[PDB]
Amino acid sequence: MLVLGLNGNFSAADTDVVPQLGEVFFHDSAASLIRDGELVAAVEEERLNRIKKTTKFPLNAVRECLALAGARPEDVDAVGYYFPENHIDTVLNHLYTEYPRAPLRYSRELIRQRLKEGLGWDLPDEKLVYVPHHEAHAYSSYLHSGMDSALVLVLDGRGELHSGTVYRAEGTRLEKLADYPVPKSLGGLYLNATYLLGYGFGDEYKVMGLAPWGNPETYRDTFAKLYTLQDNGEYELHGNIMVPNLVSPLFYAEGFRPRRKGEPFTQAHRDFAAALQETVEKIVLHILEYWAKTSGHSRLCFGGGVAHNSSLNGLILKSGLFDEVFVHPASHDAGAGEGAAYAAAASLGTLERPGKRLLSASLGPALGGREQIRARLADWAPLIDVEFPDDAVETAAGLLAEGQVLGWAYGRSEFGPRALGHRSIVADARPEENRTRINAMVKKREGFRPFAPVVTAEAARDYFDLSGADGNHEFMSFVVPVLPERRTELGAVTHVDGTARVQVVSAESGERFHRLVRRFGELTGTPVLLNTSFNNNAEPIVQSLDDVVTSFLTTDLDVLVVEDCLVRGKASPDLGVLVPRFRPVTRLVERRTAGPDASAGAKTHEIHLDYDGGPSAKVSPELYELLGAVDGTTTLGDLAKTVGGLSDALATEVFALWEQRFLTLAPAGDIGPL
Amino acid sequence: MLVLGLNGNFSAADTDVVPQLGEVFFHDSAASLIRDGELVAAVEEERLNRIKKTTKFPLNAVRECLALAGARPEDVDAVGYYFPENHIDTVLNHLYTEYPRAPLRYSRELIRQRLKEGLGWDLPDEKLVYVPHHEAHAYSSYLHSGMDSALVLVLDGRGELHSGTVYRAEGTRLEKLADYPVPKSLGGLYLNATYLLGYGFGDEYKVMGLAPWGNPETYRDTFAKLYTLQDNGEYELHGNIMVPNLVSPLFYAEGFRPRRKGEPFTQAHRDFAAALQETVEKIVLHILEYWAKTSGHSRLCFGGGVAHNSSLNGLILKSGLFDEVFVHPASHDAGAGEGAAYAAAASLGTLERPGKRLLSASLGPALGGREQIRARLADWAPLIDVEFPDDAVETAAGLLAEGQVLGWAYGRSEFGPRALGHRSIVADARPEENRTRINAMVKKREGFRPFAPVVTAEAARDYFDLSGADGNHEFMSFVVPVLPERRTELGAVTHVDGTARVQVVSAESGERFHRLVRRFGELTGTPVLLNTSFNNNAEPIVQSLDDVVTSFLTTDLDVLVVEDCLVRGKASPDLGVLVPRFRPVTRLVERRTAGPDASAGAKTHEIHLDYDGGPSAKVSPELYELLGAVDGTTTLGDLAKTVGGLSDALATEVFALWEQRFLTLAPAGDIGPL
Ligand SMILES: COc1cc2cc(c1Cl)NC(=O)C[C@H](O)/C(C)=C/[C@H](C)[C@@H](O[C@](N)(O)OP(=O)(O)OC[C@H]1O[C@@H](n3cnc4c(N)ncnc43)[C@H](O)[C@@H]1O)CC(=O)[C@H](OC)/C=C/C=C(\C)C2
Ligand SMILES: COc1cc2cc(c1Cl)NC(=O)C[C@H](O)/C(C)=C/[C@H](C)[C@@H](OC(N)=O)CC(=O)[C@H](OC)/C=C/C=C(\C)C2
Ligand SMILES: Nc1ncnc2c1ncn2[C@@H]1O[C@H](COP(=O)(O)O)[C@@H](O)[C@H]1O
Ligand SMILES: [Fe+3]
Ligand SMILES: [Fe+3]
Secondary structure, eight states, X not given: OEEEEEESOOOOSSSOSSTTOOTTSSOSOEEEEEETTEEEEEEETHHHHOOTTOOSOOHHHHHHXXXXXXXXXXXXXXXXXXXXXXXXXXXXXXXXHHOTTSOOOOHHHHHHHHHHHHHSOOOOGGGEEEOOHHHHHHHHHHHTTTOSEEEEXXXXXXXXXXXXXXXXXXXXXXXXXXXXXXXXXXXXXXXXXXXXXXXXXXXXXXHHHHGGGSOTTTTHHHHHTTEEEOSTTOEEEOOXXXXXXXXXXXXXXXXXXXXXXXXXXXXXXXXXXXXXXXXXXHHHHHHHHHHHHHXXXXXXXXXXXXXXXXHHHHHHHHTSSOSEEEEOSOOSHHHHHHHHHHHHHHHSSOOOOXXXXXXXXXXXXXXXXXXXXXXXXXXXTTTXXXXXXXXXHHHHHHHHHTTOXXXXXXXXXXXSSOOOSSEEXXXXXXXXXXXXXXXXXXXXXXXXXXXXXXXXXXXHHHXXXXXXXXXXXXXXXXXXXXXXXXXXXXXXXXXXXXXXXXXXXXXXXXXXHHHHHHHHHHHHSOOEEEEEESOOTTSSSOOSHHHHHHHHHTTTOSEEEETTEEEEEOSSOOGGGEEEEEOTTEEEEEEEOBOGGGOBOOOEEEEEEOSTTOOEEEOOHHHHHHHTTOOSSSOHHHHHHTTTSOOHHHHHHHHHHHHTTSEEEEESSOXXXX | OEEEEEESOOOOSSOOSSTTOOTTSSOSOEEEEEEXXXXXXXXXXXXXXXXXXXXXXXXXXXXXXXXXXXXXXXXXXXXXESSOHHHHHHHHHHHHHHSTTSOOOOHHHHHHHXXXXXXXXXXXXXXXXXXXXXXXXXXXXXXXXXXXXXXXXXXXXXXXXXXXXXXXXXXXXXXXXXXXXXXXXXXXXXXXXXXXXXXXXXXXXXXXXXXXXXXXXXXXXHHGGGEEEXXXXXXXXXXXXXXXXXXXXXXXXXXXXXXXXXXXXXXXXXXXXXXXXXXXXXXXXXXXXXXXXXXXXXXXXXXXGGGGOHHHHHHHHHSTTOSEEEEOTTOSHHHHHHHHXXXXXXHHSOOOOOSSOOOOOEEEEEOOOXXXXXXXXXXXXXXXXXXXXXXXXXXXXXXXXHXXXXXXXXXXXXXXXXXXXXXXXXXXSSOTTHHHHIIIIIIOOOTTSOOEEEEETTTHHHHBOOOSSEXXXXXXXXXXXXXXXXXXTOOSSOOTTSEEEOEEEOTTTOHHHHHHHHHXXXXXXXXXXXXXXXXXXXXXSOOSHHHHHHHHHTSOOXXXXXXXXXXXXXXSOOGGGSEEEEOTTEEEXXXXXXXXXXXXXXXXXXXXXXXXXXXEEEEOHXXXXXXXXXXXXXXXXXXXXXXXXXXXXXXXXXXXXXXXXXEEEXXXXXXXXX
């Protein structure tokens, strides 16, 4: 029994179903493969097309999933989609009324077109199953819990009719208990408030991280105007008819001005975040307290995008409402896609289920075999120096104790937003200066941002306060207090309020990552490491070996440990041996506006990526003429000939374009099949 | 007292407040001037910046209005803006939260800045008066009716808080009787339905045009699901949580699918438009039946953009609910901008009321003086031939009876959407072929819509059924039955139901134009002409002299009468003397897209207009090189020399671009200070 789990929109690699399709119209595209109830493969399309939280159809991810499972498309019994058919089709239909050129292709046609043109797979109509959205979330969250009965809570932006559903799960049966309509959405509330801090969709956990720096008292009475707790677990949010945003009109009237990009985070900003955080905590806990005592369950599964609010999860844990809590590593809409497969397998036959609580998120493609990895690292030889230690884990521990910041890339990539020892960046967790530098030099982001620790399972309760319910900590789902006599020891990973979004790694969770953390602690006294996602500010988590090295070279990381190979930057790297390649979304433009006295303006030259919210950059005329000659095979050095050779001026410009990922730079060839 | 009335957004000429600012965000920019209670001058900014229904700050409109009154900016006693401050500032705030790079400038600052920069006008805060939107509409509609008391009804898409408001008006006193909340919007219902017909904002008149071709019984039980008539002149529209459109989800669920660009109108589309129109007729007559009885009033003013529904107005006339009915020539938001002037004067000093009933929309800038116009037509010599008849109206009547189709440009331009004898295209109205001949050829549009008759006040009732109430017909506000006997006589101007959007011209509403239609009737026994707006498919009604000549040369009209001059296109006109200039929104682009095997793809060259819904055209490499060298002074022929001279190929390419108004082409210099 082999079932595919789908979610996302239906856009091709180089265009969107409608021009400039908005970034929130079916986001976080992914594919999941379940076999005999076990999740054997899952990857988000963002990892393969390098567009954070992409809406494009997860074609690549279906191809990679089938590969990991050793299956051909003809082997797939059923395909599940994470939304009912009428609903996605009504929203497609709306987009078409706004774009009269766009042909009327609805989701069934478009799914079948993409699979057949992209994989040579005529999918039979009888094998395509559409699924209620919060039902898909529920299966995902609950089946992987290792629990045979639980209260299941789903909160996200919105399914087809509800912003929240409450379920009773017993064995493999889900039974709806309650639902909350769309205009009461808490993910809608959080995203609306996020826009006031100069952020956008995808940034909600940055706002979460800012919250502890603020005082929730300043704006408590203001947020109080926007919601009302009612009897028997109910609540309302209070809308307006001015703008499609629940928060900004009231705050404007009270003198709050939205932050601008580039501007610092004032104390009123920090307090806004703090009150918003408190608001959602008050509502969800109000919900949960009710349905805890009403349904009689002592175990909770929390899912939906809101369950990535690890601060909220830490409060649920410490509330005494439950004895166990479980959160899926992908509780946002990629997880809903996985659950759509369970639900599809349920409607065509009986539901085979996992036999154990999900402990590892390490479910995407791998980096490659030993010999193809050595072969590809030889292709980067003009740019990198490679050592091959006897015991790479032992070496890396030593380098981490010496204050090196390491890139760490092993095995299959993590499903979901957190990195957990397979696409990580790690450093000594003890020096407070490691927070300030890794924020400013490495990940190149805001100074208030916290960093998450990983601790061995054996030493966890030596450092953190895991008391209360038993939560799963293999995926940094819970914010947890650092024990007060440890907060100075752990300067980098102890947040401003003495909490940390902790990861407890074990031999069973991640044998190798646990070996590294164990040895570091043998060497230093402190079995705890800083562990942040391996990606710069312009890309999702690195996936392939070429992704890893590109990110290593364009980030200020000291050394890279990839599959037992020690990689370091060469002194004088040779950029010219790299082969430029346009992304399907790369565009080159020469533009002239109007000028003085109705003249033509002076030429300018930009490179930009053709999706909603994609970056832009001015380029020099020499670089513009170079990039126009890109054939995907000529190296950068021979391309530069046509503009008088790769000057140092040109290399630096290319390099900065490379950092922002406007086009692929990587040696000739590729690593090959895996 | 001198009061300026403003409406529209705050964008400058070349950019918008936020990038690609939606075309519905405070549209139909305009400026009006009142002095001692009289409307001295009013021009929509669309005529001056040449963008249909523009949202941009009406700076040119204000320069034109001040000069028309012989006034410095400093002379003005108050400025009135057609929306409350906190509402426009809350919408601006919402735009700013979605574009975190936009500086936080709200309306009071933006208004002062556009005036300080654009007119050197240091506007003191004391003088800026924001106005309730539906109050603005009502003042405009009622003070020009020449009525001394009336029931005032405003229906539009929405103001700050309502979509419909009912007023009692006595002299200068406005008293509010009733409101209808935003989600009951009939403008909204209408505009929603228009998107299902392949059309968009500003195409509502076309949907009205199509509805008689259709049978409302088909989709009548369907629309009945979307609304309910309730007691006491109340109605409910029934929404949905699927999409921001009232109509599309339910119609998708029954198999109605929207038409696409360039698709012919099917019988389903025809019937849809018929049921839509019947519905808003039902609801609006249900509102009016109640408020006519409850207020007891015999007179009705009607305003807000829904009042530009000529067919609905005709049902109000033919209902026996009122004696008089009045509709202002600019009942859409440009009229709310004038009414904002009046309300500012009332809030400050006292409100001086306009003398009599408005009879003439001729309120814009004029073409120029006889010496100026003659001189500028001399600059146009390489392209036209000019006769100076002794009696132009006399000659023009002859050609009309001979069968020529005439451009007719006199005096000041009409305020509001209808051309009424000052920027018109006139023709014999008797031959049915004249429909397709003028629509589907010279103006290059669509021919399902009949044309509009202008009849003399004297013969008016010998041709049309003006019975029922006493409506004002000086602005084509009412659709009325064509008398059955004259139906065959008037083939060009009579619909499938026998009705006609009637202009009734009198010696007092417009002298020159009355003489013209009388004389034509003495020469033919039919004192009815066809009257359409002087504009092709890519422009609003022409304004300037150069506007009028440009439009004549890029359409297939036979003759042009402009201020007693008879203008025809030369045998071989010399394009090369024209000086091309960029419009502030013109962009010239060389694009390269992604290509096969990750290469740099296709080098296309494009000209486009940078605004929401602006046209785009591909250009040849030679045009690209030519256009990029436009400097605002050098002629087209001299510019063409840098690419081998103005071939017939290039001149056709350039001409086709001129038809679509990507550029200004006109002789060197201007007409001068008008
Ligand atoms: C993302 O962010 C937001 C999004 C939205 C709202 C908001 C935000 Cl923040 N929030 C806000 O607050 C908006 C603010 O308020 C505003 C822009 C107000 C503008 C000034 C106002 O336009 C007015 N005042 O209605 O203009 P008017 O000329 O008098 O009439 C025009 C009407 O008349 C009908 N109509 C004409 N001709 C005929 C005929 N021949 N037959 C039958 N119907 C006809 C037309 O069909 C049309 O509906 C509102 C309006 O309608 C817009 O649609 C044009 C609404 C569009 C809906 C939205 C933008 C969703
Ligand atoms: C202009 O057209 C619109 C606009 C809007 C709504 C709709 C339509 Cl048509 N109507 C819909 O039905 C949208 C549909 O359901 C979608 C896209 C569901 C996705 C999978 C949601 O993803 C989840 N599961 O959270 C996305 C969100 O909620 C998101 O916040 C991330 C908030 C979005 C608010 C929006 C997009 C306002
Ligand atoms: N850390 C967070 N806190 C609160 N809400 C969040 C958080 N992350 C995502 N969301 C909301 O979850 C919604 C998306 O959920 P989903 O459909 O599962 O992808 C959006 O409304 C997000 O704003
Ligand atoms: Fe969801
Ligand atoms: Fe209006």
